[PDB]
Design an enzyme around this catalytic site. Sequence first.
Site, PDB file in Angstrom:
ATOM      1  N   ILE A  38     -27.813  42.246 108.596  1.00  0.00           N
ATOM      2  CA  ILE A  38     -26.902  41.309 107.946  1.00  0.00           C
ATOM      3  C   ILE A  38     -27.706  40.531 106.908  1.00  0.00           C
ATOM      4  O   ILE A  38     -28.481  39.625 107.240  1.00  0.00           O
ATOM      5  CB  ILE A  38     -26.190  40.394 108.957  1.00  0.00           C
ATOM      6  CG1 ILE A  38     -25.072  39.595 108.280  1.00  0.00           C
ATOM      7  CG2 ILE A  38     -27.161  39.547 109.790  1.00  0.00           C
ATOM      8  CD1 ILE A  38     -24.129  38.923 109.252  1.00  0.00           C
ATOM      9  N   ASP A  39     -27.521  40.882 105.637  1.00  0.00           N
ATOM     10  CA  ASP A  39     -28.379  40.383 104.572  1.00  0.00           C
ATOM     11  C   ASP A  39     -28.364  38.858 104.521  1.00  0.00           C
ATOM     12  O   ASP A  39     -27.435  38.199 104.994  1.00  0.00           O
ATOM     13  CB  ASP A  39     -27.940  40.952 103.223  1.00  0.00           C
ATOM     14  CG  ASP A  39     -28.379  42.389 103.026  1.00  0.00           C
ATOM     15  OD1 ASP A  39     -27.760  43.092 102.201  1.00  0.00           O
ATOM     16  OD2 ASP A  39     -29.344  42.817 103.695  1.00  0.00           O
ATOM     17  N   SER A  40     -29.428  38.298 103.940  1.00  0.00           N
ATOM     18  CA  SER A  40     -29.543  36.848 103.841  1.00  0.00           C
ATOM     19  C   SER A  40     -28.383  36.249 103.059  1.00  0.00           C
ATOM     20  O   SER A  40     -27.964  35.119 103.333  1.00  0.00           O
ATOM     21  CB  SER A  40     -30.873  36.469 103.192  1.00  0.00           C
ATOM     22  OG  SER A  40     -30.936  36.921 101.852  1.00  0.00           O
ATOM     23  N   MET A  43     -25.776  36.123 105.381  1.00  0.00           N
ATOM     24  CA  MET A  43     -26.018  34.924 106.176  1.00  0.00           C
ATOM     25  C   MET A  43     -25.456  33.693 105.482  1.00  0.00           C
ATOM     26  O   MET A  43     -24.911  32.796 106.134  1.00  0.00           O
ATOM     27  CB  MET A  43     -27.513  34.755 106.437  1.00  0.00           C
ATOM     28  CG  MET A  43     -28.053  35.637 107.538  1.00  0.00           C
ATOM     29  SD  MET A  43     -27.591  35.068 109.182  1.00  0.00           S
ATOM     30  CE  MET A  43     -27.544  33.295 108.945  1.00  0.00           C
TER      31      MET A  43
END
Lengths: 83, 742
Positions: A38-40, A43
Site C-alpha cells: 500500500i504505497d505511501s 497511505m
Amino acid sequence: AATQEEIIAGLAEIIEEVTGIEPSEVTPEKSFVDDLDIDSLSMVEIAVQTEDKYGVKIPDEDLAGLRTVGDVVAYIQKLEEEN
Amino acid sequence: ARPGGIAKWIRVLAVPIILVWVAIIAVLNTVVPQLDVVGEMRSVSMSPDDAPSVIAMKRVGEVFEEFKSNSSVMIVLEGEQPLGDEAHKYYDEIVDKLEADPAHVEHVQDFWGDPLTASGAQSPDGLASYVQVYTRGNQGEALANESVEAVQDIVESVPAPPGVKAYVTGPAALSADQHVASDRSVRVIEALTFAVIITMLLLVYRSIVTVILTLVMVVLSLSAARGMIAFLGYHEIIGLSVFATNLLTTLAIAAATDYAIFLIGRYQEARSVGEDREQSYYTMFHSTAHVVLGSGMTIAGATLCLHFTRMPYFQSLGIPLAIGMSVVVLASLTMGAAIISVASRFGKTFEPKRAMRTRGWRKLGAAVVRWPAPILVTTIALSVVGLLALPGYQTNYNDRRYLPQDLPANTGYAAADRHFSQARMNPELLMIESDHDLRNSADFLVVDRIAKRVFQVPGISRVQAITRPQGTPSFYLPPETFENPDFKRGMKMFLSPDGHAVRFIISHEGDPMSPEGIKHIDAIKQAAKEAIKGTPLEGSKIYLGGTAATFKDLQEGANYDLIIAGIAALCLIFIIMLIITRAVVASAVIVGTVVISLGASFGLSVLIWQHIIGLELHWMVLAMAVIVLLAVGADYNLLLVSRIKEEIHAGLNTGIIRSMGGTGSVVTSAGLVFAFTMMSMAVSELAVIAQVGTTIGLGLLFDTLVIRSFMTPSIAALMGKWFWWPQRVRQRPLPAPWPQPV
C-alpha cells in the site's frame, strides 16, 4: 474509547476502498506496504479518509513512521483516549 | 437515482427518438446541399460594410462610375523575355475578354495599355506587368469568389504567346484561394480526425462494439449539426464562412465524442460499481446529462459571444457555431442516451471490458488534497510561465504565408515579388472630392502637391496620379495641355467623369499587410489633409481604401473584438456555471483555472508556431482559440466540480479524492480526444485553421494534463467550505462512531 476491533474494522473498510484488499486481510500483527503493498501516497489516502469520515487527526510527520496497521491503530487510540 | 423525469422519458422513448433524429439528419442532408457546398456558395464578406475602407472603396467606384463592389484582382503577366508587342497583344486580348463579361468584371484599370501610364504597370526590369480588375461582390463573399473564378477562367481561355504566363492574384483572389484550399483539405482533415478518434477510443474502451456505437453517435450528431447549419446557410437566415465550416466540423465532432465519452464512462463506472443496466443508466443520466447540457451551453454561449462582434469572420462564428454546438448537445443528450439505453438491453455492448483506472487517479487526488498549496503554486507557476511569449509575440495578418504556395493567388504573388516590390501588388486608392470642377490648373498643382506630400510619407514608395502617371516623373499646367488627347485620356483614367475628384494609387515601401502599413494609412490621410490645407478646394473628403486601410479597420476592430468577446464569453460561462453548480466560488474557480490554462496555451502555441514552425500566429487564431478554450476547459472543470459536489456527502476532502478517482479516466479520455482532434487541424491547408487547431489542442492537452487535474482540485481543497459559497456546505462531516467488528 473504542477497542481494537472497532478501529481495525474501520480501517479495513477504508482500505477496501483505497485498494480493494479484503477487510479480514487487515490485522494488527501484519504490516503496511512492506507487507500489504500500500504505497505511501495510498497511505496519505488512508489518512485523508480517516480524517474525513472518522474525524481523527493524522499529520504527515507521524505518517512516515506508520509502518504497521498496528502502529496506526495504536496512534488512533493514543489520540483518542485523552479527549 | 429515482427512476423518473426526463431520463425516464428518454429511456422509454429511446427507439422513437433515435428514429426522429435519423429522420431529421436525413431531411437536413437531402433537402439542402452539404456544409462545404453551402459554405462555398454562402460565404460571408471579408470586411464589414460599415468599415471605413469598404465604404471608401464603394464611394470610389460610384464617383468614378467604374465599379460598385470592394474586390480587386491583380492580373500579372510575367515573361522570360521583356514584355514586347506580343505581350501587349495578349494583355489587350485579356482586357477585352474581361470587359466582355460584366457579370463578374465590374471594371479594368487598363494602365498598361495606355502608353502614358504603361511604364507605371511595368516592372523596373521590364519583365512583368500588373493590371487591376475590380470584380463584383465584396471581398470574401461568394459573389466575389465566383468573379475571381470567372477571371481565372477568362485568363486561362486566352492562349498565351511563347512564354509570358498570366496569373490572377490579389485580396479577392486570396480569399477565393483560401476557400479552394479548405475544399482541398476538408476531406483529409475529416479523415485524420476520424482516424484519431477511432484509434484513441479503441485504446480507451478496448471494445469494438462500444467504439462502433460511439462513432455512430458522433457521426449522427456531426451530420445533424452540419445539416442544420447548411439548412440555415442555404436559406440566408445566417451568414457563413470557411472558418465557420471548418471550425464547426471539428468542434462538432470533438465535442460530440466528448459527450459520448462522458456518458459512456459514467455508465460504465455505474455498471462497475454494481448497479444494474437500468439503474446504471439512470445514475449516468442524473449525474452527467446536466453537466453535458451545461458544457454545451458554455460552448454555444462562448461561440455566440462572437456574434456581438463587428467583423464578418467572427459574426460568422457567432451564430453558426452557436446553433451547431447546440444541436450537437441536443443530439448527444437525446440520441446518445437513447442509444445507450437500447444497447444496454442488447447483450453486453457497453459493459466495460476492463476495470476502470482509479487507483492512480485516486492517488493523484490524495496528493492534491493533502498538499493543495504546493500543488496549486506549482501549477500556477507552470501555467503562467507561458506568458513569457508576450515579449516577442507577433500577429501577422499576411494571408500569403497561411495558404499553400501552389494556389493561383500565392503563385501570382510569387511572380509579382520576382519583379515588383511586395507592396506594389496591393495598392491604395486615395481621393479628394471637390465641390467644384477639378479640371483647373490651380487644382492640378494642388493635386501635384498632394502627390508629393503622400510620396514624402515614410514607408510609401510610389504615388500615381494625373500629375504623376508613374512612380516619379513650380509645377504649372498651360491651358493648351488640357486639350491634349493623351492628357484627356489620362484625365478620364485618373479623374471623376464629372471632374470633381481625383484618384491616387499608393504603393508602400514596406509590407502594406502589417502594422507598418496600418500606421501608413493614418500618415497618408494626415499628409493629404495638410496638403489640401490652404487651397481653394479646402474641405474635400479623404476617402482612402485598399488592403492596408481594410486591415487598419480590422486591426482596431480585432483588438476591441478580442477584448469584448473574451469578457462576454467569460461572464456568460461563469453565469452558466453558477446556474449549474449553484456555487459562485466554484464557478469563479473554474473561470480562474480556465483563464490561467489559456495563458499557458497562448505561451506554448506562440512558442511553437513562431519559433520552431517559423510561421507567425494569425490574428483570428487568438479569438477562436480563446473562445474554444474558455468553452471546453470550463466544461472539463465543470464535470470535475459536479462530481465533487456529488461526492461531498461522504466528506469534503474525501469527496475530492473520490471524484478525481471516478472521473480521471473519463476526463483524460475526453480531453485527449478533443485535443488530438484539434491538433488534427494541423493537416489543413489553411495554415490559419492549422494554427487555431494546434493552439486549442495544445491548450486542452495542457488543461487535461495539469490544470483540471491539479489546479482545480487543489483550489477546491484549499477553500474547503468556502468553495461552495453561498451554498451551506460543511467540512468533514460528524465523526461517525467506529463500526462494530464483522
